[PDB]
Write a protein that binds this ligand. Structure first.
Ligand SMILES: *Cc1c(COP(=O)(O)O)cnc(C)c1O
Ligand SMILES: *Cc1c(COP(=O)(O)O)cnc(C)c1O
Ligand SMILES: [K+]
Ligand SMILES: [K+]
Lengths: 389, 255, 389, 255
């Protein structure tokens, strides 16, 4: 390979031999794209004029009144599409084009990645097919209509559990036979190399902007940047530019679901064990036998049974710290932001906010400048929350 | 390891190719599975490629996926598989037994430990579906230490370097854009383990053709699982149909 | 008054005597606010760091391929809240505060203005009560939950028709008694002066940005700027900075509903007659007797039985031209933008886009640089459209 | 115009105040409405303030709104109102009749034309609810040309300038934060048309108090509509109850 597929012991390219050439060509295309000012100019123009970058950095005083915490929210909820997913989805599409490909293959659970894949493909003239498990299909009807509206072809999978992992399989089987003309658009900073690396690089503007912005508003770097961790893309995008700023804490929040002790959660980095699946060596939800399990969370966008390899690595060396947040804590954070700032955050993002509220509340006299990555908007969560309250 | 060497030697003396059927351990149940396997051996299968049920066969098609589902519903666990493997070996001392595995189940409680159990039950080779030659170092070293043959897949989109790695890394047999004669001849040139054509072997004519191309034999994967899926309702007739299929495929390797 | 309440013969302050002092104090506060650099700095900071301004100006090549039309979309759909409504709602809230008021009174139909009112009030520490007609309540449940989530108090009206006009009445009755501590946050560029004037000024950044942006991308002003006309705020906000640029066409699109000839439309400016209602002299939907009627449209955000007085005026003198667009034309424009650009526009905005597509399609060899004000996003319309197709 | 002058003169000779009830034309129906009005006049009402059903009483409370709904359901149109007005006038030659209107219905087919019809049917004054003194120019000029008294509302949050405008602009009577004696005395100083207290006149004590403050009388708005809304089920008893209420309120103006 041209780049290191590993982050310590985590990462790699655990795919059948037939898929290696596909990964190798993609890696080489990425490296050339990364050094081409033309590609960069093109990516930037799209992010700026189409997606709406740079996103705002909102200081939320109402929520922190009476404490010594100063909180800022990186406004990815204001990005075209409703979430941070759009950034990388645009870079990958430009990459598929650099490779002379006209098709895009993807798969979804909560539907958000499918929508992002469809919007990018439709914008850049790519034929897009999306694999989604039936169980997810009939449950995420809005996003399904959304995808079709944007010309994407949504293909319902029924392999066993008929869900994400079963869709990923079909997407890969398809890709092995069509990689010559089709590009597999992975949804997060996980899977086989160069994916964790590519998704990070195409999301790193989150951290870069936040740094320039906080430096602008406060004249200093934050004390900590906090982000939710489903597969790891929004978190890594935020963390990336701050990794060499040793004074900046990097906090990743995994979903605690109904409570770690209950076993119903989506927190493999801290409460699971290493395995080899999804084409990578990384911590995962699995039985004692070695059978991968499902990650639970009130927020469907956080149900990845594993995590990105760079997160597993950053946590092994002490650089980044990962915590957990329950459905109730996320629900409370959700309600708090709506009532005090007029922003309906995505239940995924609410996990990140929930932790910062905990850091503030537990030690209200502690002076701390925090940045929460508000990864997406929660208009799609107004019903879920409604059914709870 | 050795059982393969002796098999390919006996095959060459008989101037015939090997017919290797694939089947999922525990599909559609333990008792049914054991009986199917004996029928395959009785029918004339020269070796066997056995699959162990995994969460989701990361690199397997629908046919296999559906077979895994039946195995899961029947409550078949990898531990059960090893119990089945021991018994199969206890009944048949010389037939080579290869396992089709996924990395997690091998890595789960330790790679080395996995191969030690394989050696213990009498398994001859292991092909880890989602482990390409680039990530094979630990798996093949562990396999070698435990006298297990590390099988590698030589794809159609393989290149020369890949051909060379598979040749030096693999043992037992090579699981077979480019010309068939190209792969086979380059594999022999590189002293690769005997190549077994695994692509679309579903009819007798396929077996003869493979051997004709110079492949040491053929692996019929899904074909076997098909008969199983169809005759699921009448287990007695499932066996009867499996018997005939294997007999035909095997007869097609006798030159 | 300090400012002219009229635009030709249109406008005025047709409110009961008791409400005149409220209008007069508001006007004086506006004039002082407009000349105070502090207020301006505060408004701008909120628009920029909270709302996400400036909004993008997206050139849509896919939709105009094969024609000599160059189209740009002013991205108000990317504004915090989903629509342009947010801009003015923030300025008015700052105005209520300049007047020492702590409460906000409003009313809604489709719910969007209620949501915007609630988000602004919640952000700036204002107690907000919103009047909404029962018929609109039970139909716009998402927005109702949204409002309550943001702390607003939603009060269901049942006066007769229990709808917008019936809510406006209750909101006004309330305001007449509480204007001392409460500010009436009007939703569009209509009603009594200084409202048409204030809403225009707090929306004019749309036109100002578009001008700087098009001048930046193309080096020339557009040939025409197109916007939908419900009550007139997004349109006037876009038109405003271009009124003195005589070479720039200003096209306002009223909803044609099922067809002008059917009588089921919301196009009073071109297909209604002057009346005095909503506290202003303006063209309205009314029977021969003088009984105001309801405006129909597939898009609930365009059901205002009247129009802003400045629009009526600009149309009397030849400055701006107004057309009509049917539900089907808007539905087609909706589908086209999703499929060709990856943007789901609000059905309100789709009326504006639909007209530009008509200007392009009818004369494909005509060279024209157009700007459509994409007033809001259509995620809230994905079901409506779904029920049609 | 004139009927008011003569009424307030006769009232002063009798040293009593005027009691003016309000009612919606056509509520709860034409026949019922006409009978109610006759009962009000029979009961002792010195003048009448009649409302014409409009889309939504832009400046009216729920009680009136609900009255309008009943009028609308009964299919009462402004044209029907004028037919009712003519007949009421035909029966009662001296009672002043004021109309409570909204700008649109007056402006609809021409302001001047509206007042011409008012003069034609025998209406004495018109108060356009949503037209403040600042927008009154055309309405009052039209009213004056047609010998109709333009009535203006003098609110509690009125100031001196407003007091002066209402005084010079208004005719017939002035529809009445600041002290009651302040308004009344300042109105008399400015030679305003006799002030009629319209706020919360729902009990006899209210009428006497108003006249006591120096107001030329009192206007009972919703009070009348209340009896109507309640007795809606028994029209015969509605009249009977209206009779008594007006008699009480009127007796309270006799000093
Ligand atoms: C997809 C999603 C996530 C979860 O995934 P990551 O890859 O961890 O970033 C987080 N936030 C939003 C708003 C999303 O839609
Ligand atoms: C409220 C709304 C409108 C209609 O009203 P205007 O006052 O005419 O601007 C237009 N577009 C969107 C997206 C809206 O939400
Ligand atoms: K996860
Ligand atoms: K309208």
């Amino acid at each position: 390979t041209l780049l290191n597929p590993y982050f310590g012991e985590f990462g790699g390219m655990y795919v059948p031999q037939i898929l290696m050439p596909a990964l190798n060509q993609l890696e080489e295309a990425f490296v050339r794209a990364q050094k081409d000012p033309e590609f960069q100019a093109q990516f930037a123009d799209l992010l700026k004029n189409y997606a709406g970058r740079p996103t705002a950095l909102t200081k939320c005083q109402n929520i922190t009144a009476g404490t010594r915490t100063t909180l800022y929210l990186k406004r990815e909820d204001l990005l075209h599409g409703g979430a941070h997913k759009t950034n990388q989805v645009l870079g990958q599409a430009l990459l598929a084009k650099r490779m002379g490909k006209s098709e895009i293959i993807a798969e979804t659970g909560a539907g958000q990645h499918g929508v992002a894949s469809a919007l990018a493909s439709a914008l850049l003239g790519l034929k897009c097919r999306i694999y989604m498990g039936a169980k997810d299909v009939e449950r995420q009807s809005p996003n399904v209509f959304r995808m079709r509206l944007m010309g994407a072809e949504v293909i319902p999978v029924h392999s066993g559990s008929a869900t994400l992992k079963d869709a990923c399989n079909e997407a890969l089987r398809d890709w092995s036979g069509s990689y010559e003309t089709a590009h597999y658009m992975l949804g997060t900073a996980a899977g086989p190399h160069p994916y964790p690396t590519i998704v990070r690089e195409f999301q790193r503007m989150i951290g870069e902007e936040t740094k320039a912005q906080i430096l602008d508003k406060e004249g200093r770097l934050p004390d900590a940047v906090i982000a939710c961790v489903g597969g790891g893309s929004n978190a890594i995008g935020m963390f990336a530019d701050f990794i060499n700023d040793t004074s900046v804490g990097l906090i990743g929040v995994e979903p605690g679901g109904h409570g770690i002790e209950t076993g119903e959660h989506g927190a493999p980095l801290k409460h699971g064990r290493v395995g080899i699946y999804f084409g990578m060596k990384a911590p995962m939800m699995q039985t004692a036998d070695g059978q991968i399990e499902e990650s639970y969370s009130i927020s469907a966008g956080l149900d990845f049974p594993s995590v990105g390899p760079q997160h597993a690595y950053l946590n092994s060396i002490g650089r980044a710290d990962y915590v957990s947040i329950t459905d109730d804590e996320a629900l409370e954070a959700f309600k708090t932001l709506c009532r005090h700032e007029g922003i309906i955050p995505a239940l995924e993002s609410s996990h990140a906010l929930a932790h910062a509220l905990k850091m503030m509340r537990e030690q209200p006299e502690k002076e701390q400048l925090l940045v929460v990555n508000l990864s997406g908007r929660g208009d799609k969560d107004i019903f879920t929350v409604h059914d709870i309250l | 390891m050795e059982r393969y060497e002796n098999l390919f030697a006996q095959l060459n003396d008989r101037r015939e190719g090997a017919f290797v059927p694939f089947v999922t351990l525990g599909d559609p149940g333990i008792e049914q599975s054991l009986k199917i396997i004996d029928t395959l051996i009785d029918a004339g299968a020269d070796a066997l490629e056995l699959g162990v049920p995994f969460s989701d066969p990361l690199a397997n098609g629908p046919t296999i996926q559906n077979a895994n589902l039946r195995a899961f519903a029947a409550g078949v666990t990898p531990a059960q598989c090893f119990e089945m493997l021991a018994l199969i070996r206890e009944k048949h001392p010389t037939i080579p037994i290869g396992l089709l595995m996924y990395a997690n189940l091998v890595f789960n409680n330790g790679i080395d430990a996995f191969y030690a159990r394989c050696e213990q039950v009498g398994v001859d080779s292991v092909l880890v579906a989602d482990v390409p030659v680039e990530e094979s170092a630990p798996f093949r070293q562990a396999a070698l230490r435990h006298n297990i043959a590390p099988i590698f897949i030589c794809p159609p989109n393989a290149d020369d370097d890949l051909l060379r790695q598979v040749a030096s890394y693999g043992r037992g047999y090579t699981y077979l854009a480019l010309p068939l004669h190209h792969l086979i001849e380059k594999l022999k040139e590189y002293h690769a383990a005997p190549a077994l054509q695994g692509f679309g072997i579903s009819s007798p004519e396929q077996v003869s053709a493979a051997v004709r191309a110079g492949a040491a034999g053929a692996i019929s994967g899904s074909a076997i699982v098909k008969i199983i899926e169809k005759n699921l309702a009448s287990p007695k007739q499932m066996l009867a149909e499996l018997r005939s299929f294997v007999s035909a495929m095997k007869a097609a390797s006798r030159a």
